[PDB]
Every structure is written in structure tokens, then in C-alpha cells.
Amino acid sequence: MISSLWIAKTGLDAQQTNMDVIANNLANVSTNGFKRQRAVFEDLLYQTIRQPGAQSSEQTTLPSGLQIGTGVRPVATERLHSQGNLSQTNNSKDVAIKGQGFFQVMLPDGTSAYTRDGSFQVDQNGQLVTAGGFQVQPAITIPANALSITIGRDGVVSVTQQGQAAPVQVGQLNLTTFMNDTGLESIGENLYIETQSSGAPNESTPGLNGAGLLYQGYVETSNVNVAEELVNMIQVQRAYEINSKAVSTTDQMLQKLTQL
Amino acid sequence: MISSLWIAKTGLDAQQTNMDVIANNLANVSTNGFKRQRAVFEDLLYQTIRQPGAQSSEQTTLPSGLQIGTGVRPVATERLHSQGNLSQTNNSKDVAIKGQGFFQVMLPDGTSAYTRDGSFQVDQNGQLVTAGGFQVQPAITIPANALSITIGRDGVVSVTQQGQAAPVQVGQLNLTTFMNDTGLESIGENLYIETQSSGAPNESTPGLNGAGLLYQGYVETSNVNVAEELVNMIQVQRAYEINSKAVSTTDQMLQKLTQL
Amino acid sequence: MISSLWIAKTGLDAQQTNMDVIANNLANVSTNGFKRQRAVFEDLLYQTIRQPGAQSSEQTTLPSGLQIGTGVRPVATERLHSQGNLSQTNNSKDVAIKGQGFFQVMLPDGTSAYTRDGSFQVDQNGQLVTAGGFQVQPAITIPANALSITIGRDGVVSVTQQGQAAPVQVGQLNLTTFMNDTGLESIGENLYIETQSSGAPNESTPGLNGAGLLYQGYVETSNVNVAEELVNMIQVQRAYEINSKAVSTTDQMLQKLTQL
Amino acid sequence: DLQSSFLTLLVAQLKNQDPTNPLQNNEL
């Protein structure tokens, strides 16, 4: 239609993406294991009319040629994987992580997802699952005669048996570090899957090789500062209104152009 | 009549189709699992007057011969089959999908339809029907003594019998993947049916073979961009504006010719 | 008229139905025993113009044929039957339920309706009525000479006579369970009647066969969440505004069409 | 019970506007 109309369309779309990202951060405050997102933009094509080189005479050169430019394509929504703040839930099953690393989990397809959520459960077959029937890799089966389950900060999980005054070792819980935590692609339930953007996974025991440590009885809350999200919300709301007003101004131009 | 009037008429019809599609998308917000449509247009005949080759001299070539062209025939409406935004409905009968796939349904004719909606129900005989009494496939029968129902994220459905302390496995609710989601023919009722453009259905348990995951207690909202549709109405309205101005111009020229 | 206007009419009617449902939910807070309603939407016909298959040439297939479609028909208004949250009235003539089950009542015509509102009374003739002369099924008559009426969690009603230091068992007050609670057809007064969709009524004494228990001195408050209702109201209000804007766009299109 | 003296005063003067649509949606 009109060039400015397409440019302003891209402006509104970009600001809508920004607002959706901020609202997602703001809603998932007080959600354990959530990481904030930051939408980063990228300008589109520039239609050249006169090249910034493009000598006119033999001696003039025409500096700063005329090019219009379009679009505010959002290049990425980078996800910041910073450490959350640990709080005493005082539940035996809820273990938090301190530092890099993730929990490996088996999909029903045999492939692996990763989650920073030690809010485990035990199923009827005794395996430790985490919010969805997520079998953990490698498998750990809780014996039925367990009275309590304890998780060490080195990953050694051992249960308490009746009569037996010994913590029989029932499993070893391993973390995984990636060279790019931003490259992880979510698949919902805040579980991420390795992609070519993340890079190869490296598995290690908690603590060693730069991985984190396991703290039982703690929940890792979100790393979302409400004040920061609100100042972002104010700026984004202003940008959203300004782009809508640009659209409306172009529309009024077309108004009087047709009425002609 | 006049070669301008036919062209402008096709333009008006194309913009009216555009507005039709826009209104259908726009009224179908809040419709679970709905997929946005977008119209693709396509120019009509080009009536060649001078051939673009067809050398004039023995050496010249007559570049870019004369051809007028007509029409803006709308060639298609594609459907964007992207994932919708899950929202927590917190109802045990509602299931959303994360990833590719469609729930199969047997129509009263016996032919198979496919719906991406989980607002399920249990009828008087206990079957899982879907908001209109359409039986899901393969048949799932809730026992009359069941008190609670859960759909495992892998797709296993198991109820809680009375007295028994075990959620017995009553069925497996499997998805269906099509090579071409876009080619499905919609028949209303939030259903799609196979046509040879989509390809043969590939039925698999959720997760396996590229199928998605089942999220009980979530509903998949329509992926309709409200801001995009608002600006689309502005654009389509002013295009219709302009095309009617072209029809007015042709009318005025033609009536001056009659007055001649 | 215009195929856009009809689609927008359907959208407006759908959003108005949604807002009426939301207002009924929101105005029924502090109405004891009330159950929330949820609207389920559904799209109508799709006027196929080119079949999605329908090979054009001998080798081409023409994917994603042209389909326009209409309408946002509200397919259903389900009645989510959750457990209402109890409150202490400190009154003996109010009994509330925990779990499945309804109080059966002979409507003046002899047909048995159901109500989850144990706000009983005592009439002139000793019988048990429910806010309008609704006589309980089976018949239980309250003698005047008893002092305190207690209804145990097992559902048996026994009263205490003057002098006689024993709670004579005067009767039994049993509940009714259904395979599908949502199928019950409301006829007002917080009464529902059996329908061919709900399933055959199963009457049982409280606590048995999966039925719930009775608690005297409590009133079951409505299971409507004001926060969820206000959020849903916001969403519906925006949808209504956008559909009205679509109607406005169609009207302007038509108006400048006729001005020509 | 003071909450009901205003919570139901709000939702007795808001459970009518939504019918008649003088909507502000923002003083809510």
C-alpha cells in the first residue's frame, strides 16, 4: 500500500513481541526454575535510491546517499540463565542447583531433555520423576521399604530402610553443562532440549568440571526482578503507543489522499 | 465493457476476499486450537500486444514489449499451523498439545476427522467425546466407578477406581501427524479431514515419530495476532477505498464518452 | 449483504454470549452452592472455493485450496463441577456436601430433580422442604417433639426426643451420583434435572459407592474465583472491541462502495 | 465481613456494566 504503512506494521509487531516477552516474565514471577527473557531487535532492508558512493560528477561524490530503510525484525529472544535465589521449602523431595548444570530426563522417545527443577516425585514403580512422569537419566528406583530419601550435594541419593542403620546408596545424580546455555530450546514444562545452537553436552558429577551443587530442601525461585521488568514495561508501552500512532497517521494520510 | 473496469472489479473482489479471511480469523479468537489463515493473491492473464523478443530491426531487439495484464485472482488461503499459547485451565478433561499432531475422531458417517482440541467430555456411556459428541479414537471408556482421571504426558490415560489404590491404565490416547498440516480441509466443528493434498495420516503415540506431548489441564489458544489483524483491516480497507476510486475514474471517463 | 458482515455478526454474538456467561459467573459470587460455567466455541461452515486437493494439472496438486469460512458458533456452555469451599454458618438447618452427589427432590409434578444445596427447612406438616416446598426423596417427616437434629457423615438422620436419652434414628438422607455431572440441565433455583446425556441416576447413602459425605452447619460457597473471572472479562472485552471494529470496517467499505 | 461490604459492592456495580458496556476495564 504505502511504504510507511509496512514499516509501521513491523514496528507494531516488534513492540508486540517485546510486550509479550515482558508479560511472560512478569507472570512467571514466583515460579521456580524460570529464567527471564530479553527480546533483541534487528533492522531490516534499506532500499537504496542513491548509492552512498555513486559519484555524480567527475569530482563530486554525493556523500550519505539516500536510502529509506524498513522494518524492526526481532532477531532473537535471548534467555538469561542466571542463578536463582534458594529458599527453604523444607520438603525432602525439592532439591535446588547452585551454579551451572541441568538435570537430565528421558522423554518417552528415549531422547533427553534438561531441567533445572529438582522438584522430583516418585511414581508407583519407584522411579524418581519430575512434574510429568519424567523418568530421570540414569534411572533411579526408590525401594518400597524406604522411610525417607536423602540427597547429598555430591549427587549420592540414599534411602533409609527399616531396621538397617545405614544409608544404602540408591543412585547417583549427574548434572550436564553446555558451552552455551542460551542455545537451549524449550519444549514446555520449562524443560529444554539440546540443539545445534547450544552445543555438545558435557556430563559430570555435581561440583566438578564447573557444574553446580545440589541443595536438598531448597527451591530455586525465578531470577526475575519485578522492578526491572516494570521499567521495561513502561518503556515498551511508550514504544507501543508511538508505533500505533505512526500507523494511524499513515492511515489519515491515505484518508485525505483518497478523498482527493 | 471497458478493460479498466474488469481489472478494477477483480481488485475489489480480491480485497473483499482479504477482508473475509481477516474477519474469520478475527472473530475466531478465544476459539481453542484455531489456526490463523492468510490469503495469497495472484495476477491474472497478461494480454501480449508486442512480443518482448521479436526484433525490430535486423539488429535491435525491442526490449520489454507491451503487455497490459488484468486481474488479481486470489490463488489460495494458507493456514499457519504453528503452536498456540498454552494456558492453564486446571480442568482434568482438558488436554493441550505441545508440538505436531491431531486427535483423531470418528464422525457419525464413519469417516475420520482430526481435531486439535482437547476440551473433552465424558458422555452417558463414559466415552471421551469432544464438545459435540464426536467419539475420539481409539475408543476410551471411563468405568462408571472412576472418581478421577489423568492423561499422562506421554498419552496414557488412567482412572482412579473406587476402593482400589491404583490408577489402572484404561487406554492410550494417540496423536496423528500429517506431512502437510496446511492441506487439511476444514469442515467446521473445529475438525479437519484428509485430502490428498495433506497426505496419508501417520498415527503414533504422543512423542514418538514427531508427535507432540499431551498437557493435561491446559488449553491451546488460537494463534491469532490481534494487532496484526487490526492493521490488516486498516490496510484492506484503504485498498478497497483505492480500488473503488479507480472504478469511479473509469465510470467518469466512460460517461464523458457517452456525452461525446 | 457482504460475507464479511455475517462473519462479524457471528463473532459479536459469540463474544456477547461469552460476556453474558462471565457476568453470570461474576454475579453469582456469594451464592451458596453455585457452579461455574465455561463457554466452548466452535467455527461454522467453510465455503470451499477451490478444493484443497483437486489436482490442477496432471502433475500438480494445488496444496492448500482456497477456503473462506464463517462464524464462531458457541458449541456449548459446560458447567464445571468442582468442589465448592465450605463456610461455617453455625446453623443446624444447613447441610453441605463433600464430593459427588445431589439431594433428590420431588418437584410438584412428581418428577425428581436434584440440588446441591442442603439449606433445608421444616414445613407445617413435619416434612423436609428445600426453599420453596421441595419435598425430599424419600419422604422424611420431622416431628415437633425432637429438640436437636443431627445428620452424621454417614448420612443417617436421627433426632433426640424429650426425656428419651437416645438419638432415635428417624431416617436416612441419601445422595445421587451421575456418570456425567456436566450433562445435568439447570432449571434455576440451583436445581438440575436428569437428561439423556447425564446418565442414569444412581442413588446411594452418603460416603458409599463413590458418593460424598454430609457436613452439618456448613454452606458450600460458590466455586467461582474472582481473579480468574476478572482476567477472563478483560480478555472478552478486548475481543468484543475488536469484533465491533471489524463490523465498522465492513460498514465503511460498503458505504464508500455505494457512494460510487 | 467488611470485605463483603465492598467486594460485593464492587461486583454488584460491575456485574452490570459488563452487560451494558460502559467498559473501562482499568479502574477494576
mmCIF file of C-alpha atoms in Angstrom, chain B:
data_model
loop_
_atom_site.group_PDB
_atom_site.id
_atom_site.type_symbol
_atom_site.label_atom_id
_atom_site.label_comp_id
_atom_site.label_asym_id
_atom_site.label_seq_id
_atom_site.Cartn_x
_atom_site.Cartn_y
_atom_site.Cartn_z
ATOM 1 C CA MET B 1 -17.308 -3.051 -21.450
ATOM 2 C CA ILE B 2 -14.059 -1.279 -20.607
ATOM 3 C CA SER B 3 -10.808 -3.109 -19.976
ATOM 4 C CA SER B 4 -10.161 -0.898 -16.936
ATOM 5 C CA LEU B 5 -13.428 -1.773 -15.233
ATOM 6 C CA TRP B 6 -12.876 -5.528 -15.306
ATOM 7 C CA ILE B 7 -9.424 -5.119 -13.767
ATOM 8 C CA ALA B 8 -10.724 -2.837 -11.035
ATOM 9 C CA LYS B 9 -13.583 -5.256 -10.385
ATOM 10 C CA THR B 10 -11.126 -8.101 -9.843
ATOM 11 C CA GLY B 11 -9.188 -5.864 -7.479
ATOM 12 C CA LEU B 12 -12.321 -5.116 -5.467
ATOM 13 C CA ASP B 13 -13.177 -8.805 -5.294
ATOM 14 C CA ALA B 14 -9.662 -9.651 -4.117
ATOM 15 C CA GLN B 15 -9.794 -7.054 -1.348
ATOM 16 C CA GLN B 16 -13.228 -8.311 -0.313
ATOM 17 C CA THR B 17 -11.843 -11.842 -0.030
ATOM 18 C CA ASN B 18 -8.993 -10.409 2.023
ATOM 19 C CA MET B 19 -11.474 -8.800 4.411
ATOM 20 C CA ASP B 20 -13.465 -12.042 4.590
ATOM 21 C CA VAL B 21 -10.413 -14.018 5.668
ATOM 22 C CA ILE B 22 -9.455 -11.263 8.106
ATOM 23 C CA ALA B 23 -12.888 -11.281 9.715
ATOM 24 C CA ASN B 24 -12.896 -15.065 10.019
ATOM 25 C CA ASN B 25 -9.514 -15.012 11.747
ATOM 26 C CA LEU B 26 -10.542 -12.071 13.867
ATOM 27 C CA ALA B 27 -13.843 -13.398 15.162
ATOM 28 C CA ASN B 28 -12.238 -16.782 15.905
ATOM 29 C CA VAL B 29 -10.196 -15.545 18.815
ATOM 30 C CA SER B 30 -10.959 -17.408 22.038
ATOM 31 C CA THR B 31 -11.584 -20.499 19.877
ATOM 32 C CA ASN B 32 -9.267 -23.193 21.197
ATOM 33 C CA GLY B 33 -6.786 -24.688 18.767
ATOM 34 C CA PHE B 34 -7.775 -22.400 15.908
ATOM 35 C CA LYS B 35 -5.210 -21.724 13.198
ATOM 36 C CA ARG B 36 -4.839 -18.342 11.515
ATOM 37 C CA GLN B 37 -5.494 -18.054 7.779
ATOM 38 C CA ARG B 38 -3.783 -15.774 5.290
ATOM 39 C CA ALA B 39 -4.765 -15.175 1.674
ATOM 40 C CA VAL B 40 -2.281 -15.414 -1.193
ATOM 41 C CA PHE B 41 -3.083 -13.442 -4.342
ATOM 42 C CA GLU B 42 -2.031 -13.944 -7.910
ATOM 43 C CA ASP B 43 -2.183 -11.865 -11.070
ATOM 44 C CA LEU B 44 -4.392 -12.965 -13.949
ATOM 45 C CA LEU B 45 -3.805 -13.030 -17.737
ATOM 46 C CA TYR B 46 -1.272 -10.745 -19.377
ATOM 47 C CA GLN B 47 -2.558 -9.885 -22.836
ATOM 48 C CA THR B 48 0.534 -9.514 -25.007
ATOM 49 C CA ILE B 49 0.464 -6.764 -27.630
ATOM 50 C CA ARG B 50 4.124 -6.738 -28.697
ATOM 51 C CA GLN B 51 6.336 -9.727 -28.020
ATOM 52 C CA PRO B 52 9.284 -8.895 -25.723
ATOM 53 C CA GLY B 53 11.639 -10.647 -28.129
ATOM 54 C CA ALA B 54 10.589 -10.015 -31.715
ATOM 55 C CA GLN B 55 13.493 -7.987 -33.022
ATOM 56 C CA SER B 56 12.533 -4.694 -34.629
ATOM 57 C CA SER B 57 15.499 -4.063 -36.912
ATOM 58 C CA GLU B 58 17.784 -6.778 -38.206
ATOM 59 C CA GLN B 59 19.898 -5.992 -35.137
ATOM 60 C CA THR B 60 17.716 -4.344 -32.490
ATOM 61 C CA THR B 61 15.546 -6.383 -30.158
ATOM 62 C CA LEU B 62 12.697 -4.217 -28.776
ATOM 63 C CA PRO B 63 13.259 -4.839 -25.058
ATOM 64 C CA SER B 64 10.311 -5.126 -22.691
ATOM 65 C CA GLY B 65 7.473 -5.411 -25.154
ATOM 66 C CA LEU B 66 3.995 -4.109 -24.474
ATOM 67 C CA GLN B 67 1.646 -6.248 -22.417
ATOM 68 C CA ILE B 68 -1.205 -4.948 -20.301
ATOM 69 C CA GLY B 69 -2.416 -7.622 -17.958
ATOM 70 C CA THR B 70 -5.532 -7.969 -15.842
ATOM 71 C CA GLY B 71 -6.820 -9.175 -12.552
ATOM 72 C CA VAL B 72 -5.735 -10.126 -9.037
ATOM 73 C CA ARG B 73 -7.246 -13.617 -8.713
ATOM 74 C CA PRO B 74 -6.775 -14.928 -5.156
ATOM 75 C CA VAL B 75 -4.904 -18.184 -5.622
ATOM 76 C CA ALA B 76 -5.141 -19.632 -2.123
ATOM 77 C CA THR B 77 -5.575 -19.250 1.621
ATOM 78 C CA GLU B 78 -2.861 -20.983 3.568
ATOM 79 C CA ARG B 79 -3.282 -21.835 7.235
ATOM 80 C CA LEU B 80 -0.404 -21.188 9.633
ATOM 81 C CA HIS B 81 -0.140 -24.375 11.680
ATOM 82 C CA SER B 82 2.073 -23.051 14.443
ATOM 83 C CA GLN B 83 1.837 -23.896 18.118
ATOM 84 C CA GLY B 84 -0.677 -21.912 20.112
ATOM 85 C CA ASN B 85 -0.190 -20.429 23.546
ATOM 86 C CA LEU B 86 -0.992 -22.923 26.267
ATOM 87 C CA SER B 87 -2.996 -21.574 29.168
ATOM 88 C CA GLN B 88 -3.753 -23.336 32.452
ATOM 89 C CA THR B 89 -7.435 -24.160 32.544
ATOM 90 C CA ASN B 90 -6.845 -26.507 35.512
ATOM 91 C CA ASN B 91 -9.565 -28.904 34.328
ATOM 92 C CA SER B 92 -8.915 -32.627 34.204
ATOM 93 C CA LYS B 93 -10.905 -33.126 30.991
ATOM 94 C CA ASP B 94 -8.939 -30.522 29.017
ATOM 95 C CA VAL B 95 -5.757 -31.514 27.195
ATOM 96 C CA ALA B 96 -3.482 -29.360 25.058
ATOM 97 C CA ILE B 97 -0.821 -30.365 22.551
ATOM 98 C CA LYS B 98 2.804 -29.208 22.517
ATOM 99 C CA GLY B 99 4.101 -29.949 19.021
ATOM 100 C CA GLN B 100 2.754 -31.571 15.883
ATOM 101 C CA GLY B 101 -0.286 -33.812 15.846
ATOM 102 C CA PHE B 102 -4.075 -34.113 15.738
ATOM 103 C CA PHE B 103 -6.581 -36.056 17.811
ATOM 104 C CA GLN B 104 -8.469 -38.488 15.612
ATOM 105 C CA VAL B 105 -12.265 -38.521 15.745
ATOM 106 C CA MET B 106 -14.822 -40.812 14.118
ATOM 107 C CA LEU B 107 -17.681 -38.900 12.516
ATOM 108 C CA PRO B 108 -21.208 -40.375 12.552
ATOM 109 C CA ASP B 109 -20.694 -41.187 8.871
ATOM 110 C CA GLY B 110 -17.787 -43.381 9.928
ATOM 111 C CA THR B 111 -15.257 -41.186 8.159
ATOM 112 C CA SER B 112 -12.327 -39.952 10.210
ATOM 113 C CA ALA B 113 -11.850 -36.293 11.115
ATOM 114 C CA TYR B 114 -8.970 -34.755 13.030
ATOM 115 C CA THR B 115 -9.200 -32.027 15.653
ATOM 116 C CA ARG B 116 -6.502 -30.180 17.574
ATOM 117 C CA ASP B 117 -8.788 -29.518 20.563
ATOM 118 C CA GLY B 118 -8.780 -31.096 23.991
ATOM 119 C CA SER B 119 -11.915 -29.692 25.632
ATOM 120 C CA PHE B 120 -13.032 -33.281 26.086
ATOM 121 C CA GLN B 121 -16.034 -34.713 27.912
ATOM 122 C CA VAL B 122 -17.451 -37.989 29.175
ATOM 123 C CA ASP B 123 -20.885 -38.917 27.872
ATOM 124 C CA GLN B 124 -23.552 -41.105 29.459
ATOM 125 C CA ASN B 125 -21.775 -44.308 28.377
ATOM 126 C CA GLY B 126 -18.447 -42.886 29.536
ATOM 127 C CA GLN B 127 -16.624 -42.362 26.249
ATOM 128 C CA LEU B 128 -14.290 -39.465 25.572
ATOM 129 C CA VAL B 129 -16.335 -37.313 23.218
ATOM 130 C CA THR B 130 -15.292 -33.829 22.135
ATOM 131 C CA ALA B 131 -17.713 -30.933 22.549
ATOM 132 C CA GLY B 132 -20.446 -32.116 20.232
ATOM 133 C CA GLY B 133 -20.495 -35.827 20.876
ATOM 134 C CA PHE B 134 -17.752 -36.826 18.451
ATOM 135 C CA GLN B 135 -16.077 -40.008 19.687
ATOM 136 C CA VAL B 136 -12.289 -39.927 19.907
ATOM 137 C CA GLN B 137 -10.128 -42.715 18.528
ATOM 138 C CA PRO B 138 -9.202 -45.271 19.655
ATOM 139 C CA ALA B 139 -12.241 -45.632 21.890
ATOM 140 C CA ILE B 140 -11.629 -44.775 25.550
ATOM 141 C CA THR B 141 -14.248 -45.917 28.065
ATOM 142 C CA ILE B 142 -14.297 -44.464 31.564
ATOM 143 C CA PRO B 143 -15.602 -47.042 34.061
ATOM 144 C CA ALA B 144 -18.667 -45.899 35.966
ATOM 145 C CA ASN B 145 -16.904 -46.223 39.333
ATOM 146 C CA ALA B 146 -13.993 -43.973 38.363
ATOM 147 C CA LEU B 147 -13.536 -40.875 40.535
ATOM 148 C CA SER B 148 -10.566 -39.110 38.934
ATOM 149 C CA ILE B 149 -8.931 -39.099 35.508
ATOM 150 C CA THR B 150 -5.415 -38.190 34.409
ATOM 151 C CA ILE B 151 -3.768 -38.216 30.985
ATOM 152 C CA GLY B 152 -0.068 -38.893 31.279
ATOM 153 C CA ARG B 153 2.094 -36.532 29.285
ATOM 154 C CA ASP B 154 3.070 -39.472 27.065
ATOM 155 C CA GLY B 155 -0.611 -40.074 26.319
ATOM 156 C CA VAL B 156 -1.573 -42.857 28.732
ATOM 157 C CA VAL B 157 -4.996 -42.347 30.297
ATOM 158 C CA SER B 158 -5.627 -43.979 33.671
ATOM 159 C CA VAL B 159 -8.515 -43.514 36.084
ATOM 160 C CA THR B 160 -8.820 -43.861 39.850
ATOM 161 C CA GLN B 161 -11.218 -46.675 40.708
ATOM 162 C CA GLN B 162 -13.167 -46.577 43.938
ATOM 163 C CA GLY B 163 -11.616 -48.657 46.708
ATOM 164 C CA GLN B 164 -8.649 -49.719 44.602
ATOM 165 C CA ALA B 165 -5.379 -47.933 45.397
ATOM 166 C CA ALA B 166 -4.030 -47.969 41.839
ATOM 167 C CA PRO B 167 -4.741 -45.739 38.824
ATOM 168 C CA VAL B 168 -5.355 -48.554 36.348
ATOM 169 C CA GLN B 169 -4.394 -47.989 32.696
ATOM 170 C CA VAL B 170 -7.657 -47.717 30.774
ATOM 171 C CA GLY B 171 -6.313 -46.537 27.440
ATOM 172 C CA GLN B 172 -3.673 -44.938 25.268
ATOM 173 C CA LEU B 173 -4.682 -41.713 23.522
ATOM 174 C CA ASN B 174 -2.553 -41.366 20.407
ATOM 175 C CA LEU B 175 -1.913 -38.496 18.008
ATOM 176 C CA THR B 176 -1.766 -38.348 14.229
ATOM 177 C CA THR B 177 0.814 -36.483 12.182
ATOM 178 C CA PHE B 178 0.308 -35.338 8.597
ATOM 179 C CA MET B 179 3.154 -34.457 6.285
ATOM 180 C CA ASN B 180 1.178 -31.330 5.330
ATOM 181 C CA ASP B 181 -0.825 -29.719 8.117
ATOM 182 C CA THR B 182 -1.731 -26.892 5.741
ATOM 183 C CA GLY B 183 -3.506 -29.093 3.211
ATOM 184 C CA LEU B 184 -6.170 -30.325 5.606
ATOM 185 C CA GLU B 185 -9.679 -29.371 4.533
ATOM 186 C CA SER B 186 -11.606 -27.793 7.389
ATOM 187 C CA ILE B 187 -15.236 -28.888 7.656
ATOM 188 C CA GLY B 188 -16.072 -26.757 10.653
ATOM 189 C CA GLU B 189 -16.746 -28.023 14.163
ATOM 190 C CA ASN B 190 -13.004 -27.467 14.738
ATOM 191 C CA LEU B 191 -12.377 -30.552 12.588
ATOM 192 C CA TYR B 192 -10.155 -31.258 9.595
ATOM 193 C CA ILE B 193 -10.437 -34.177 7.183
ATOM 194 C CA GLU B 194 -7.906 -35.884 4.961
ATOM 195 C CA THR B 195 -7.465 -34.790 1.374
ATOM 196 C CA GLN B 196 -4.805 -35.997 -0.999
ATOM 197 C CA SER B 197 -3.036 -32.666 -0.607
ATOM 198 C CA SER B 198 -2.288 -33.285 3.065
ATOM 199 C CA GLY B 199 -1.061 -36.851 2.658
ATOM 200 C CA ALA B 200 -1.909 -40.067 4.409
ATOM 201 C CA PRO B 201 -2.309 -39.928 8.199
ATOM 202 C CA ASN B 202 0.508 -41.338 10.329
ATOM 203 C CA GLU B 203 -0.907 -42.384 13.696
ATOM 204 C CA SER B 204 1.526 -42.671 16.596
ATOM 205 C CA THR B 205 1.584 -42.462 20.357
ATOM 206 C CA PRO B 206 2.391 -38.931 21.573
ATOM 207 C CA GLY B 207 6.069 -38.094 21.407
ATOM 208 C CA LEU B 208 7.051 -40.870 19.029
ATOM 209 C CA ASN B 209 7.505 -40.086 15.338
ATOM 210 C CA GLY B 210 7.469 -36.334 15.775
ATOM 211 C CA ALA B 211 4.129 -36.155 17.538
ATOM 212 C CA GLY B 212 3.773 -33.635 20.329
ATOM 213 C CA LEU B 213 3.193 -34.061 24.025
ATOM 214 C CA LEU B 214 -0.132 -34.044 25.834
ATOM 215 C CA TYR B 215 -0.527 -31.399 28.529
ATOM 216 C CA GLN B 216 -3.478 -32.204 30.748
ATOM 217 C CA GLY B 217 -5.095 -29.225 32.385
ATOM 218 C CA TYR B 218 -4.015 -26.864 29.608
ATOM 219 C CA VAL B 219 -5.881 -25.443 26.631
ATOM 220 C CA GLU B 220 -4.276 -24.343 23.376
ATOM 221 C CA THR B 221 -5.415 -20.844 22.500
ATOM 222 C CA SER B 222 -5.854 -19.665 18.941
ATOM 223 C CA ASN B 223 -2.701 -18.238 17.402
ATOM 224 C CA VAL B 224 -4.492 -15.124 16.157
ATOM 225 C CA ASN B 225 -2.441 -11.928 16.344
ATOM 226 C CA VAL B 226 -4.885 -9.188 17.276
ATOM 227 C CA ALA B 227 -2.601 -6.259 16.435
ATOM 228 C CA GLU B 228 -1.649 -7.837 13.121
ATOM 229 C CA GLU B 229 -5.317 -8.294 12.239
ATOM 230 C CA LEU B 230 -6.180 -4.720 13.260
ATOM 231 C CA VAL B 231 -3.565 -3.236 10.981
ATOM 232 C CA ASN B 232 -4.612 -5.728 8.316
ATOM 233 C CA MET B 233 -8.118 -4.296 8.469
ATOM 234 C CA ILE B 234 -6.709 -0.792 8.041
ATOM 235 C CA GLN B 235 -4.700 -1.877 5.012
ATOM 236 C CA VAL B 236 -7.513 -3.844 3.360
ATOM 237 C CA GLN B 237 -9.995 -1.037 3.926
ATOM 238 C CA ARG B 238 -7.807 1.552 2.296
ATOM 239 C CA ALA B 239 -7.031 -0.788 -0.601
ATOM 240 C CA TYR B 240 -10.776 -1.203 -1.172
ATOM 241 C CA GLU B 241 -11.024 2.591 -0.957
ATOM 242 C CA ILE B 242 -8.443 2.954 -3.724
ATOM 243 C CA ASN B 243 -9.959 0.312 -5.986
ATOM 244 C CA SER B 244 -13.361 1.965 -5.744
ATOM 245 C CA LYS B 245 -11.698 5.243 -6.684
ATOM 246 C CA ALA B 246 -10.360 3.511 -9.795
ATOM 247 C CA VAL B 247 -13.868 2.292 -10.637
ATOM 248 C CA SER B 248 -15.101 5.861 -10.178
ATOM 249 C CA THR B 249 -12.468 7.155 -12.583
ATOM 250 C CA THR B 250 -13.415 4.619 -15.239
ATOM 251 C CA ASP B 251 -17.098 5.438 -14.780
ATOM 252 C CA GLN B 252 -16.428 9.144 -15.232
ATOM 253 C CA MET B 253 -14.327 8.649 -18.359
ATOM 254 C CA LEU B 254 -16.950 6.366 -19.839
ATOM 255 C CA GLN B 255 -19.786 8.782 -19.150
ATOM 256 C CA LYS B 256 -17.827 11.614 -20.733
ATOM 257 C CA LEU B 257 -17.544 9.304 -23.730
ATOM 258 C CA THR B 258 -21.313 8.786 -23.763
ATOM 259 C CA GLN B 259 -21.829 12.547 -23.509
ATOM 260 C CA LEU B 260 -19.498 12.840 -26.512
#
